[PDB]
RNA sequence: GGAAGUCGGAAUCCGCUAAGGACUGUGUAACAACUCACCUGCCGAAUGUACUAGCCCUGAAAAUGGAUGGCGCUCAAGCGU
RNA sequence: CUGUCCCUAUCUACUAUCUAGCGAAACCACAGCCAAGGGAACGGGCUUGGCAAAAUCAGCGGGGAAAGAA
RNA sequence: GUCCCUACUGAUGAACUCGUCGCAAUGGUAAUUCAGCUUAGUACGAGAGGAACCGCUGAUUCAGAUAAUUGGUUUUUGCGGUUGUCCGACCGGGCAGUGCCGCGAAGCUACCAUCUGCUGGAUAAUGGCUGAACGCCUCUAAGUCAGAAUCCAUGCCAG
């Protein structure tokens, strides 16, 4: 569940990627960190199992 | 093994309580309440609407 | 992998540690001496015991010299101590008997003399195959 | 579920009522109570003990030949479910029960003539 | 032994108290929480299990159930509570017309010699147009109270015991606004409530009772042995207990005349065993037949309440398909369900011939 | 089966820290000067011992986990010898062993001195001395621990090559197509790149042919050099070429693609034929798709024919890019291996005395088919739905719902309620789902 | 068609399965993976019954039958027998027998023309089997093992017998039956063919540990997978088997 | 075998200069590529290296619940004058 | 079979709540709730804290007993 | 060669008119581990091998109850058999500190029998968001997210 005021979009710009936009920087970044932390691997090999949902680009909407 | 007080165990218990037992007990209470309601329906001062005074301590005796 | 059967229901335990038991197969051994059981919960001063369908670790007392050299796993097939099956029927056998089984769960003999406990037949597929009477 | 009959005495051995014993020969002995269990373990003869259906039928205290008694049998070739068949079976059960009771009254009176 | 149930003092009151009602939220409909009953004994059932994942699936399993006779329960009062920094406080109570002789016996100790003068001025307080006062108490409950309970008493007159004194308790109303629940209680004054309206079938509930007393018992049986944490000799038994998670399997209507009948055995018989419940008698009223054992002696008062929390097991969602109910005599090693069965089995007797 | 079960070999500092933490934490460390002298002696003696048994257990585990080169198949023996400098390996193990002996001697001597100690200060100094002398020993055994850790990792990563199994050993010169053929034939990941020494170790894959499991071993690549002067990696191939009963597949490239002359390949073969003493030898000419065999000078054609007219070495043709004959090469070489192996098994079984061996009797029994003397067949009723039925395929769109998919959609594994009356064939189908009366 | 499966995690499929040319019996437990594979291989061509005998999941080792009948022990309860009848059509007759040897699947092997039983059954049991199955019933032993129902499989197209039977013994059973007979192993060298296989005239289900050579043996023996599968392949193409099971 | 500054051994020069090491790290089978040192442009005014002296933390601790005397105290009700 | 152990059986001996009546002795500075501190391996009264409610019955497994030192 | 006070465990209790129905300060506190099905012969792996979260079901230990059933116990001295002896015989009984033997209800017991054992917040190691110190940088300084069978409570026992 996200912080209030953040928009989430599965864009048809690149495949298998997500956009998290908003007005409050703390809320945007904390939501991104929460999703990144919830999708994490357990009791496996980090060097071998590369799968996850990871932040790629940070910037401004306009 | 995971204890009965584990956070993960509590989370799974919460999902189970919210998704299945919730609706089941809701319908059960609906039926029971319907039956119980059926069997049950089977001047201000001189009227009581104005609630007045009926008939150790907290303050120091002055 | 420990030869502990899975899903076994609670049953009265009648063959403790230090037990003399008969051998029901054609493996050539005559009696077994249960000295240990598998999957037990170690509590103080209690001698562990096993019911039918439970793996125990036993030594042969009399029988074939070749078998009288090593300690062997074995699952007990008949229990004289009464126990109740979930259909509420209490029952017990005439004696206490078992069969020598390898750790994987395969018997050394080819035929079991006498009847076979229903719990043991359910738990071990090989016994259900080499069983003559199942009750 | 089936209303079993006690091996030693013949009273109905209902479920959860009693103990059964498995001989090495491969056939099971179902007893309805501890009395019967202990009597068989002491190896007394049910045909001789006088509180058993075996003794009653051997000394001729109960009827053994009656069409009412050949209606009852364990069935070894099963049949298909049929609602009217089962209902008519229930009604036949009632009729045969009352006929058996009334013929039993007559048998008792003819004996104690 | 256990360091939780350690003040091994005897229960101060023979009835037992709920000590916790389920948390109230107005979203649910208006309902009562608990009820009483009297233990009769236990019988044997076989159930066609439908439990996916167990080897007893789609099979018949013999199971032990307990009988609690629950005659209709008369509602006679309404208690309104307020919430304070020191806890919950009983703001005020409102009784009803014509309290019965059994609840008045509960109020008195030497009932035979007393002048039976309980609630006479309260009956006058109703009948003499002080309905204004009673309504002002009701509006005080509506306006100031947050927890509302119902005073309810059982019917020993119907229950087959030598006693004649009833058992009052406060049963909390849940699921609604304070005004709605006050209206519910006021409308429920002087009408019996039925156990099938309080609970229903297949609902896992909680049973509160006083477990049997054994007097001064040594450590061997008191603690199961071979500072306050050391096993000591003293009172064992007669202890207030609240046992949780007991599935109610059947509610028998008492007047059905076929209470023990299932869909598979078309035998018209009641729950009462052949010869009656040992040391209790006959269950001639509505009865609750519950899985497993229950704290308490036969004919002891019971408290049946709902679970404090939503369930987490498939065991509570399960439906129960009974097959037959044991009716044989508990007085010994019985084998006959009905006197007709016994007569048909044993034939006619010397007494039958001499009488006829 | 393998050598991956070697426990980690600590460095000297890690070993010292482990042993001293262990004797610090698993054992009491509070004594007072006002205690009995016997108690003080016992306390410090127990400390020194516990340290000694901890060190002995660790060193013994190290010494006994690693394989002993004496008892391996000489394939593995020579592979380890060339890949680990068995001399250095054995001297490192010997240093570990002599350190174990030194530690146990120190413990014994200092326990005796502690027995004859007379004060708490003396006991403390004797304990400190003993535990520090053992530490100095470890700091001396810094380097062998590092070498053993490295070799432990390399052995744990080595593949499993079974010395005695039906094997296709592919060898040849750098850049002939060995790795390409290996990936085209089996599913083992062997790198294919255009540079010289891509494959620098031994790779192994597996095959199925006539329901038998075959091994395939890709070797690095040998270079025109008298065995004595070759490289280590090159000798990895030669050890493989020497100590494995197999079909050798020597890859020649008709085209000059690799960078070595056809005369150079012919030379190498004649040089390593003594390695291919009695193994089943197949030369495969690849790269036909760039230079077919017929497009050559008859002089080289005739040299190849002269090599063919010798022993039972066989010339085959393939192309590891168009996959024209890879399956044919598979079939031919594996079939020849199978027939040779069954032949030698039959000969080994056939004793000179004439008595058929027990295993041979058993295999003849498993081969024999028993048939009725009259030769009459028996009539069977196969329903025509079998012949007009469609095979189940798990990827098809319009499949049938199927019970497993039903339970998965309608719940899980311990959730779905199976309806046992759905398959009941009655007279009136509404009579289904009826509580059958049972007792009266 | 020969396929590979396991009940829950057990490779002994003959313990939990029973195939004839007119019906299939499948044990009841947990998931419907066993039922799913059996129905996918028998796509409503013949009825399949999810049953239990004696409150037990060893229906394969407790039951025996052919295309013309089904046979159950006396320990079978009436509800289970009623389930069997309502699940199977009227063209199959089902009988319960009061025999001491309750392991019917272990003591009686059956093809839809003949039969072979433990020498220690009763005469009354002999004629009632001969009547209910409508087959010629004989009294022999295999590999000197008294449990033919356990240590052998058979069909109207073939038979797999204990791997350690003598040549003359194999010839004797071949003369007795009339079906081509080969000795082979199941489930990676297991001796319990009856428990490790269940084989009908057009389908076989073995355990997942059954090796490819012995699966090929099975197919060639019972003419599965259409193709040829004569057993003549076993005689001619012998290199595979002599290599694999030496 | 391959080793182009960076798997290894030794020296480590010259020009161009603003400055650039026969190279501090990342990387390739080798390269390539990136990066550091150093240098120039923008910015604009104080920085940064080592010690010393106060106070504070750690600088080692077991086993019935307890002790600046207790409460409690934080621009003190602690510390120095 | 035993120079082994345990259980069952028998015998021997000591084993016993309340009421009526009868009715001692041992022993006794005064007492008796805990924790820390009380330099002299010393606390029971002192300091300062915990606390702390009449009168009784039963059970009892803890304290009110110990060194003297080469 | 030296039966009493007190603690703990329970049980009564005058004063507040008796009684009923409640609140909860404080004090204790509880659950534990293993295995099987599905995930799945899937992920991964040259091969051999081979998991995990969600869902489901049992078992071990511990704890609190209970007498449907089963087993044990017998002064039910309830019924029957039988030894010695006696009441003249039969019947009916007595004595042998419960003569002995069999069955034996009621009651009491036995993981020898059966039932039940529950949910929120705050944290440690640690992983982070924004962002100074220190124009780079930084989980920390201000602010703040998550997170162990841990802590504190509810559920539970005493009042
Ligand atoms: N045209 C053609 N090229 C081939 C064929 N087989 C291999 N190659 C070439 O071989 C090159 C790669 O070398 P590898 O196949 O790995 O040869 P190798 O014997 O394993 O030796 P390494 O190259 O060191 O691994 C590719 O670039 C191909 O062009 C073939 O059949 N036809
Ligand atoms: Zn009976």
From TrEMBL, chain A:
The keyword ATP-binding does not apply. Residues 1-52 form the Large ribosomal subunit protein uL6 alpha-beta domain. The keyword Ribonucleoprotein applies. GO terms for cellular component: cytosolic large ribosomal subunit. It comes from the Eukaryota. Keywords: Ribonucleoprotein, Ribosomal protein. One of its GO terms (molecular function) is structural constituent of ribosome. One of its GO terms (biological process) is cytoplasmic translation. Belongs to the universal ribosomal protein uL6 family. This is 60S ribosomal protein l9-like protein. It comes from Chaetomium thermophilum (strain DSM 1495 / CBS 144.50 / IMI 039719). The chain holds residues 166 to 227 of 229 of the full protein.
From TrEMBL, chain B:
Residues 1-42 form the DUF2423 domain. It comes from the Eukaryota. Residues 1-20 are annotated as: Disordered. GO terms for cellular component: preribosome, large subunit precursor. InterPro entries: DUF2423. PANTHER family: UPF0642 PROTEIN YBL028C. This is DUF2423 domain-containing protein. It comes from Chaetomium thermophilum (strain DSM 1495 / CBS 144.50 / IMI 039719) (Thermochaetoides thermophila).
UniProtKB/TrEMBL annotation, chain C:
Mg(2+) 1 binds at residue 41. It comes from the Eukaryota. GO terms for cellular component: cytosolic large ribosomal subunit. The keyword Ribonucleoprotein applies. Keywords: Metal-binding, Ribonucleoprotein, Ribosomal protein. Mg(2+) 2 binds at residue 45. SMART domains: Ribosomal_L14 (SM01374). This is 60S ribosomal protein l23-like protein. The lineage of its organism: Eukaryota, Fungi, Dikarya, Ascomycota, Pezizomycotina.
TrEMBL record, chain E:
Pfam families: Ribosomal_L3. The keyword Metal-binding applies. Transmembrane segments: none annotated. GO terms for biological process: translation. GO terms for molecular function: RNA binding; structural constituent of ribosome. Keywords: Metal-binding, Ribonucleoprotein, Ribosomal protein. InterPro entries: L3_arc_euk, Ribosomal_L3_dom_3_arc_sf, Ribosomal_uL3, Ribosomal_uL3_CS, Transl_B-barrel_sf. Mg(2+) 3 binds at residue 330. The keyword Ribonucleoprotein applies. GO terms for cellular component: cytosolic large ribosomal subunit. Belongs to the universal ribosomal protein uL3 family. This is Large ribosomal subunit protein uL3. It comes from Chaetomium thermophilum (strain DSM 1495 / CBS 144.50 / IMI 039719) (Thermochaetoides thermophila).
């Amino acid at each position: 569940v996200m912080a209030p005021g953040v928009e989430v979009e599965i864009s048809k710009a690149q495949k298998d990627e997500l956009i998290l936009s908003g007005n409050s920087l703390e809320a945007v970044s904390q939501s991104a960190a929460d999703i990144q932390q919830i999708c994490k691997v357990r009791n496996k090999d980090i060097r071998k199992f590369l799968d996850g949902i990871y932040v790629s680009e940070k910037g401004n909407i306009v | 093994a995971k204890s009965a007080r584990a956070s993960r165990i509590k989370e799974n218990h919460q999902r189970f309580k919210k998704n299945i037992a919730g609706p089941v007990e809701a319908a059960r209470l609906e039926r029971l309440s319907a039956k119980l309601m059926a069997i049950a329906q089977a001047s201000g001062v001189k009227s009581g609407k104005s609630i007045g005074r009926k008939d150790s301590s907290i303050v120091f005796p002055m | 992998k420990r030869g502990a059967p899975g899903g076994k229901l609670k049953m009265t335990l009648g063959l403790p540690v230090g037990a003399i038991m008969n051998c029901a197969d054609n493996s050539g051994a005559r009696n077994l001496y249960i000295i240990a059981v598998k999957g037990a919960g170690a509590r103080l001063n209690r001698l562990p015991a096993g019911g039918v369908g439970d793996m125990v670790m036993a030594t042969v007392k009399k029988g074939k010299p070749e078998l009288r050299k090593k300690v062997h796993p074995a699952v007990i097939v008949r229990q004289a101590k009464p126990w109740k099956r979930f259909d509420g029927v209490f029952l017990y056998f005439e004696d206490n008997a078992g069969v020598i089984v390898n750790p994987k769960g395969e018997m050394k003999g080819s035929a079991i003399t006498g009847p076979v406990g229903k719990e043991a037949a359910e738990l071990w597929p090989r016994i259900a195959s080499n069983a003559g009477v199942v009750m | 579920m089936r209303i079993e009959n006690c091996f030693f005495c013949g009273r109905p051995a209902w479920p959860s009522k009693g103990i059964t014993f498995m001989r090495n020969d491969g056939k099971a002995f179902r007893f309805c109570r501890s009395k019967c269990h202990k009597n068989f373990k002491m190896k007394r003869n049910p045909r001789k003990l006088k509180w058993t259906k075996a003794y009653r039928k051997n000394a001729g205290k109960e009827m053994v030949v009656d069409s009412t008694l050949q209606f009852a049998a364990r069935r070894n070739v099963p049949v298909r479910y049929n609602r009217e068949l089962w209902q008519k079976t229930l009604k036949a059960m009632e009729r045969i029960s009352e006929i058996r009771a009334r013929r039993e009254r007559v048998f008792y009176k003819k004996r104690m003539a | 032994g256990s360091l939780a149930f350690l003040p091994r003092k005897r229960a101060a009151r023979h009835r037992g108290r709920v000590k916790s009602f389920p948390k109230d939220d107005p979203k649910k409909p208006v309902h009562l929480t608990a009820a009483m009953g009297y233990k009769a004994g236990m019988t044997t059932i076989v159930r066609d299990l439908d439990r996916p994942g167990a080897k007893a699936h789609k099979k018949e399993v013999v199971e032990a159930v307990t009988i609690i006779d629950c005659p209709p329960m008369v509602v006679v009062g309404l208690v309104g509570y307020i919430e304070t920094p020191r806890g919950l406080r009983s703001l005020t109570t409102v009784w009803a017309e014509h309290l019965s002789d059994e609840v008045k016996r509960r109020f008195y100790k030497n009932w035979y010699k007393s002048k039976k003068k309980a609630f006479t001025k309260y009956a006058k307080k109703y009948a003499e147009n002080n309905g204004a006062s009673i309504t002002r108490e009701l509006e005080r409950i509506k306006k100031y109270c947050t927890v509302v309970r119902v005073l309810a008493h059982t019917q020993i007159r119907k229950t087959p015991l030598k006693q004649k004194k009833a058992h009052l308790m406060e049963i909390q109303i849940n699921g609604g606004s304070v005004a709605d629940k006050v209206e519910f209680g006021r409308s429920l004054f002087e009408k019996p409530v039925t156990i099938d309206t309080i609970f229903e079938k297949d609902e896992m509930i909680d049973v509160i009772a006083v477990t049997k007393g054994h007097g001064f018992v040594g450590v061997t049986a008191r603690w199961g042995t071979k500072q306050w944490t050391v096993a000591r000799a003293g009172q064992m038994g007669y202890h207030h207990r609240t046992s949780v998670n007991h599935k109610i399997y059947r509610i028998g209507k008492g007047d059905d005349e076929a209470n023990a009948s299932t869909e598979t055995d078309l035998t018209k018989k009641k729950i009462t065993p052949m010869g009656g419940f040992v040391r209790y008698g006959e269950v001639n009223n509505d009865y609750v037949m519950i899985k497993g054992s229950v704290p308490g002696v036969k004919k002891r008062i019971m408290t049946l309440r709902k679970s404090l929390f939503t369930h987490t097991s498939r065991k509570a969602l399960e439906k129960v398909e009974l097959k037959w109910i044991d009716t044989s005599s508990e007085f010994g090693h019985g084998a006959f369900q009905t006197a007709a069965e016994k007569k048909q089995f044993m034939g006619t007797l010397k007494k039958d011939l001499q009488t006829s | 089966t393998g050598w991956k079960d070697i426990p980690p070999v600590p460095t000297a500092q890690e070993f010292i820290d482990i042993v001293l933490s262990r004797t610090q934490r698993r054992l009491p460390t509070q004594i007072r000067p006002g205690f009995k002298i016997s108690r003080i002696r016992a306390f410090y003696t127990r400390k020194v011992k516990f340290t000694q048994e901890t060190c002995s257990e660790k060193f013994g585990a190290i010494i006994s986990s690693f394989p002993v080169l004496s008892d391996q198949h000489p394939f593995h023996r020579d592979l380890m010898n060339i890949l680990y400098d068995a001399d250095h390996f054995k001297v490192a193990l010997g240093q570990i062993s002599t350190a174990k002996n030194l530690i146990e001697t120190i413990s014994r001597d200092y326990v005796r001195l502690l027995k004859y100690a007379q004060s708490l200060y003396q006991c403390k100094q004797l304990k400190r001395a003993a535990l520090g002398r053992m530490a100095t020993l470890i700091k001396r055994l810094k380097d062998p621990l590092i070498y053993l850790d490295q070799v432990r990792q390399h052995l744990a990563r080595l593949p499993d090559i079974n010395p005695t199994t039906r094997t296709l050993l592919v060898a040849g010169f750098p850049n002939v197509g060995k790795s390409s053929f290996v990936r085209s034939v089996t599913r083992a990941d062997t790198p294919v790149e255009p540079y010289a020494f891509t494959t620098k170790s031994l790779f192994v894959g597996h095959l199925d042919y006539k329901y038998l499991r075959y091994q395939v071993i890709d070797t690095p690549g040998i270079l025109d050099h008298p065995l004595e002067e070759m490289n280590t990696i090159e000798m990895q191939s030669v050890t493989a070429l020497a100590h494995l009963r197999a079909a050798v597949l020597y890859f020649m490239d008709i085209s000059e693609q690799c960078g070595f002359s056809l005369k150079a390949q012919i030379n190498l073969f004649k040089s390593i034929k003594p390695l291919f003493a009695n193994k089943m030898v197949f030369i495969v000419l690849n790269k036909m798709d760039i230079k077919k065999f017929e497009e050559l000078d008859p002089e080289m054609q005739q040299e190849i024919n002269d090599l063919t007219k010798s022993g039972e070495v066989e010339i085959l043709r393939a192309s590891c890019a168009t996959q024209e004959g890879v399956q044919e090469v598979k079939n031919h070489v594996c079939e020849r291996l199978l027939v040779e192996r069954v032949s030698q098994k039959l000969k080994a079984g056939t004793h000179s005395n004439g008595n058929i061996g027990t295993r041979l009797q058993e295999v003849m029994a498993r081969i024999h088919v028993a048939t009725p003397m009259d030769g009459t067949t028996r009539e069977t009723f196969i329903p025509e739905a079998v012949k007009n039925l469609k095979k189940y395929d798990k990827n098809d769109p319009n499949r049938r719902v199927l019970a497993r998919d039903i339970e998965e959609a309608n719940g899980g594994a311990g959730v779905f309620n199976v309806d046992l009356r759905k398959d009941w064939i009655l007279e009136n189908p509404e009579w289904k789902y009826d509580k059958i009366p049972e007792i009266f | 068609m020969a396929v590979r499966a396991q009940f829950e995690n057990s490779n002994e499929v003959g313990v939990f399965a029973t195939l004839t040319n007119s019906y299939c019996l499948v044990a009841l437990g947990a998931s419907e993976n066993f039922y799913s594979v059996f129905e996918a291989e028998l796509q409503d061509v013949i009825p399949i019954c999810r049953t239990t005998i004696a409150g037990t999941r060893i229906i394969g080792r407790l039951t025996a039958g052919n295309r013309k009948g089904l046979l159950v022990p006396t320990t079978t309860t009436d509800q289970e027998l009623q389930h069997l009848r309502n699940s199977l059509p009227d063209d199959i007759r089902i009988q319960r027998i009061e025999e001491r040897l309750s392991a019917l699947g272990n003591v009686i092997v059956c093809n839809d023309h003949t039969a072979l039983i433990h020498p220690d059954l009763e005469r009354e049991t002999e004629e009632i089997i001969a009547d209910v199955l409508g087959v010629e019933v004989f009294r022999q032993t295999i590999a000197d093992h008294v449990l033919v129902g356990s240590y052998m499989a058979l069909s109207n197209q073939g038979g797999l017998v204990h791997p350690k039977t003598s040549i003359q013994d194999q010839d004797e059973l071949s003369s007795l039956l009339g079906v081509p007979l080969v000795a082979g192993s199941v489930n990676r060298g297991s001796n319990v063919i009856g428990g490790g296989m269940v084989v009908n005239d057009w389908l076989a289900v073995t355990g997942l540990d059954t090796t490819a050579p012995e699966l090929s043996v099975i197919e060639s023996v019972f003419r599965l997978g259409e193709g040829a599968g004569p057993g003549a392949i076993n005689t001619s193409m012998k290199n595979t088997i002599v290599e694999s099971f030496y």
